[PDB]
Design an enzyme around this catalytic site. Structure first.
Site, PDB file in Angstrom:
ATOM      1  N   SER A 135      24.531  19.645  10.904  1.00  0.00           N
ATOM      2  CA  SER A 135      24.089  19.962  12.260  1.00  0.00           C
ATOM      3  C   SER A 135      24.534  21.357  12.656  1.00  0.00           C
ATOM      4  CB  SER A 135      24.702  18.988  13.262  1.00  0.00           C
ATOM      5  OG  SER A 135      24.218  17.672  13.088  1.00  0.00           O
ATOM      6  N   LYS A 161      19.812  19.830  10.912  1.00  0.00           N
ATOM      7  CA  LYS A 161      19.606  19.547  12.318  1.00  0.00           C
ATOM      8  C   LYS A 161      19.957  20.787  13.139  1.00  0.00           C
ATOM      9  CE  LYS A 161      21.901  15.985  14.623  1.00  0.00           C
ATOM     10  NZ  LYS A 161      22.571  16.027  15.976  1.00  0.00           N
ATOM     11  N   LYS A 163      20.176  22.557  17.007  1.00  0.00           N
ATOM     12  CA  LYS A 163      20.255  22.376  18.442  1.00  0.00           C
ATOM     13  C   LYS A 163      19.183  23.250  19.125  1.00  0.00           C
ATOM     14  CE  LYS A 163      23.609  22.334  22.300  1.00  0.00           C
ATOM     15  NZ  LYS A 163      25.040  22.350  22.795  1.00  0.00           N
ATOM     16  N   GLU A 213      16.194  14.526  18.443  1.00  0.00           N
ATOM     17  CA  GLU A 213      17.230  13.665  19.004  1.00  0.00           C
ATOM     18  C   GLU A 213      17.523  13.810  20.495  1.00  0.00           C
ATOM     19  OE1 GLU A 213      21.988  12.560  17.954  1.00  0.00           O
ATOM     20  OE2 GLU A 213      20.881  14.117  16.897  1.00  0.00           O
ATOM     21  N   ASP A 238      20.441   8.504  20.610  1.00  0.00           N
ATOM     22  CA  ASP A 238      21.862   8.570  20.297  1.00  0.00           C
ATOM     23  C   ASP A 238      22.616   7.986  21.496  1.00  0.00           C
ATOM     24  OD1 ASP A 238      24.574   9.178  20.014  1.00  0.00           O
ATOM     25  OD2 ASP A 238      24.290  11.288  19.600  1.00  0.00           O
ATOM     26  N   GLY A 290      27.845  11.510  13.545  1.00  0.00           N
ATOM     27  CA  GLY A 290      29.216  11.935  13.371  1.00  0.00           C
ATOM     28  C   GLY A 290      29.815  12.297  14.704  1.00  0.00           C
TER      29      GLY A 290
END
Lengths: 368, 368, 368, 368
Positions: A135, A161, A163, A213, A238, A290
């Site tokens: 990420s 991933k 942001k 997400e 999430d 995580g």
């Protein structure tokens, strides 16, 4: 299993890197650690809540109180035939899944050890290595982003991933997609959007991301369902998934087509198995989330991530990326995109006590 | 666990009562019995399919072929870490849940025995006695029905189930309800209705039945959902619930508000636990169904019926109501509305081999 | 018609080619063959179930038992005025449509022969030649795929069906579409997808495939309906259509816009005519599916494929592509994309008995 | 079958009772009669349309023109392998189902005769007697209604249908229901209501009618569906069901839960069989409607009413209740609630030509 004693500690563990949050930048983890003793064995549990309620509502202080004065006194000395008994013992207390998870997960570890088996075997796992994803935060520029993604792809990560946020999504994601046409790319929308941004999110459909997400509110299912109905791209939930009932409602509503599983967020392994059954029955892929865990939490995550429904890479990268020194003796290191599950009964890791003592800010021993 | 060998038998046990079916009156059970051997232990499984496909599509002959020539050869001698491994091994074969269940349930027994624990403990159970309900066929008259019901109530049963059909539902049920205002009454509509009978079924709402079981087609969810929306009485699904996916779809559609769980119908304990998680997440009560099982099946049913989501009495009455002599040494007898779960590791019962041999029509021993 | 006697055989017929399945590769067909005798005439039926329940739940062993010990004894010597009588005679037995189809189709053949007419004429057919399509498996490369499609197009096939799966769909289909802009192309998605793959399936909309066959679960209607709502491309159902009630529910749900008809999968011609009426009333195109049939099954398929609702090419290619030697005297060969319907009363083919005897593994003669 | 010639007549038969309509009181039937000649056989068809378009849009004059100048010229001398060929020949002509039905039903008769079988056998029938219901117009009073109903019940009718209208429904039906608690009672709402009357219609739910026939507009499905969702009593459709497509749409919308089948209204037996398949697939009961037919039509209705989906009594009472003298030699008389299906190939009745000539107003003979 009768829990004979328990030791709770609050540790302060330095992070190798420094990351920005919704309240400044964080550089260390304050970790609630639990050791459960019974039948000459020891179960381990690690809290994922932090000092500030930024990811969600719980805090180390609030969970410490509940574990020390409510939950441990409730189960100390009680005969708990299995994890379900433990769950029922804590049922009168509303919410606080992460505080409950410390105890429920430590107990599942203790129980698996008393059964003489690795935790994954008891939970119903079918593999002993987990695919690893990574990420990345928002970078200063599109060029920097490409640079970081390229390096992580060279290292063997199996999903990247990124942001994003309004004003920083389509262009950067499109540039990455164009540079890496076959990479598995996902977006972490970080609850930075609302239904007002529907067009901006729909625009990402042409980029073929594996999932986006939690784009909308952290405690929402209804608006995500409205959004999902308009996107070909799977919405991944999430923060909204706090338990099996929410997972059931997400399925009824069509609020997400992929679920990020963080056992502590859910209240532990018992709740995670229920979510797994629900997702598997609806064809909803799972992957292991995580929360910057030290070795105990990371090992728990790896054993749970062996379940059949986890079909996508999880955030279970090498402990060395986070800590200059971990709290377990094992070196939980991944390679070529795979993280092995630590061997041994239960979660398979052992506390490095002298180091743990050195990083203990507070501690308490309680016996039945 | 590696299965070192297996013995499959087909037994014939005479029933103490005449059982009405859709094609004849049944007076004997033809039972497929499985013994799995490994690590010096023995796991037991019992088939609930019959000679004719009346309840559902499988037969003893069809299941015998699958177990003997397909399923056992595939798993004999293989390392199966847990029941999930067994599930995956049989995944390529479509349908045939009852045939798979004999092996899967026998394996769960062997596995729990290898772990040194009672099966209910490994399954997540939280009790050691199960409430008992009773079933009644269609009687010659309303007075007869009243007499039988009164007797079973004196006997201590905690739920009375009455078979009904178009032309014989409202008046008989209304008479029973008036005579016993506080009794927990249930109807077995036996797939004897269609949406054409919506009015007759809705008329039963005033009788306050605990549930009406499977009134429409045995393989339907859509029409039952249409019916359920019109009734305040919970529709209970039996034959329609063949697996977790159907259970998930029943929840999405609102096809029923109570689920009858028969582990063999579902394919075993692994599938039952998935249905349990789904039902529990939707607040849908479960109760243990019966299929005229000899002792091995009755014991398996009891261990599974200890799970938290089973909140209504099941068809787990005394073995002596069915058999002059059962195939296990234990006398599975209920008392004051309660059936104890047999003690011991695994399912807790032991076969009486001499009697088993005397009622064996066919057998085959296989080793890895 | 009173069935005076019946002969059931299990044959093992070698395949000219070898094809891969979900359980290794198959190289021969185990075929359940039925001959029904009455009024000096003989009706023929052929089973499409295999030794392993891979396509669906039935097996040769399970169907053999049902036909030999349940179905034939149920109808031998009974006066059956028409096929409806036969259907009602078997109504108490749940499921097992393919086992029932062997008898129902053989009887429809016998009945049509007693009426002195070709089967298509009795079933309501309106043509005597059927358009032929071909089905290709997953090839090693895009180049190989183009090569195979080009050759089949040169040979005159009127529709090309290509197998796909996640990771092998858009690119290969797009390359074929680009090379053959006017070809009628379809995809066989082989239940290899879930709603999680919605974007990947929607991406195929731009390729203008005639339909995508059975992409989701083999026994599903609900999720296919959700998928269909998002695609301009028609979803074609195969395994999900087990009978007229499922066809009715598919129409109510909008689960598919094209139906693959395999009479045996449906339980026979009576059930197929019902599905035909349903599809025709909803404007849903039908095409004749193939199950690697020997001459009896292929002839049955051809006569049924003459019905008005079959408006798209079917999998009824030349028998010579499958068998070095067929079990009927006729050479069922297509040319220039058309397969003629075999002439004569009933299905119009005759068994080559000496050869059939040579490939018989087991047989049984029963008389009324 | 090739139709070598045809004779069309318009007959006038006086009714034994006065029949109330929307534009006058009817005392005679003006009947379009068709005789089809081929292979030395004779097929008979009878029109149900009248001089005025009161029940629906067709008239004897309009139908006579179509049959004489359009339909017969189109099919005379042509090879028609089966009824489907006839259907396709008339496909270009829109609507006019009753006019098409005379020819299509006469052809089905001739075809069944050519096959040497009773028409019910070729249509898929499973019985040889049909249950008989009776119809009652609006009576001067409730007492009169009670008297008539009582008489018909003594006579053995198996269903009583009462015409109703706003202002004359609940009290009269409630009186009949109280006097005869076990009688099968039905209402003919005669398109006399609108959704404005939803309350009055819902009030009838307490009377437990078997069904309420066509309460809203004669060509509607949408408003009836809105009404049906509010009623537990099944809505029965008559005039709205003009073909299989309307029947499919009625199922999708839930416009009715019982269907009244009048073959001529539908366009013939081919269309009726399609509606039958649709209804049966949705569990929607059928019953045979009546249109004051002379013997040819009554016989056709009886043969079609033998199909499995016809599960409720039809308006197929004794010919003697209608005619002093019928046009067929056979006395179509019911007994103890049952009407036998006339024996013989095809429809099983024979015209009395001398009487037919005496009541012929017009005729035309045509040959190929």
């Amino acid at each position: 299993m009768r829990i004979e004693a328990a030791e709770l500690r609050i540790l302060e563990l330095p992070l190798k890197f420094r990351f920005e949050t919704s309240f400044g930048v964080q550089t260390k983890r304050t970790i609630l650690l639990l050791r459960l003793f019974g039948e000459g064995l020891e179960g381990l549990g690690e809290g994922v809540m932090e000092r500030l309620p930024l990811y969600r509502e719980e805090t180390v202080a609030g969970a410490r109180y509940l574990l020390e004065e409510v939950f441990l006194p409730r189960v100390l000395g009680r005969d708990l035939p299995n994890p379900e008994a433990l769950r029922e013992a804590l049922a009168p207390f509303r919410g606080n899944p992460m505080a409950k998870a410390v105890l429920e997960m430590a107990f599942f570890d203790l129980w698996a050890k008393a059964l003489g088996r690795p935790l994954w075997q008891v939970l119903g796992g079918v593999r002993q290595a987990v695919e690893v994803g990574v990420s990345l935060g928002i970078q200063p520029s599109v060029e920097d982003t490409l640079r970081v993604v390229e390096r992580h792809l060279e290292e063997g990560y199996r999903r990247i991933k990124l942001k994003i946020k309004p004003g920083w999504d389509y262009e950067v994601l499109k540039a990455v997609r164009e540079a890496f046409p076959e990479a598995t790319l996902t977006a972490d929308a970080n609850s930075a959007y609302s239904l007002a941004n529907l067009a901006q999110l729909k625009r990402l459909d042409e980029l073929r991301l594996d999932y986006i997400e939690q784009p909308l509110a952290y405690d929402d299912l209804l608006d995500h369902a409205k959004l999902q109905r308009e996107l070909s791209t799977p919405i991944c939930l999430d923060e909204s998934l706090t338990g099996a009932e929410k997972a059931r409602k997400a399925i009824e509503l069509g609020a997400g087509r992929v679920f990020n599983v963080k056992p502590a967020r859910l209240g532990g392994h018992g709740e995670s198995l229920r979510v797994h059954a629900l997702a598997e029955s609806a064809g909803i892929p799972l992957w292991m989330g995580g929360m910057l865990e030290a070795g105990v939490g990371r090992a728990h995550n790896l054993h749970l991530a062996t379940l059949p429904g986890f079909t996508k890479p999880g955030d279970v990268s090498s402990a060395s990326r986070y800590w200059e020194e971990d709290i377990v003796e094992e070196a939980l290191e991944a390679k070529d995109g795979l993280m092995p599950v630590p061997e041994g009964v239960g979660i398979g890791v052992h506390l490095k006590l002298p180091f743990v003592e050195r990083v203990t800010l507070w501690q308490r021993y309680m016996s039945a």
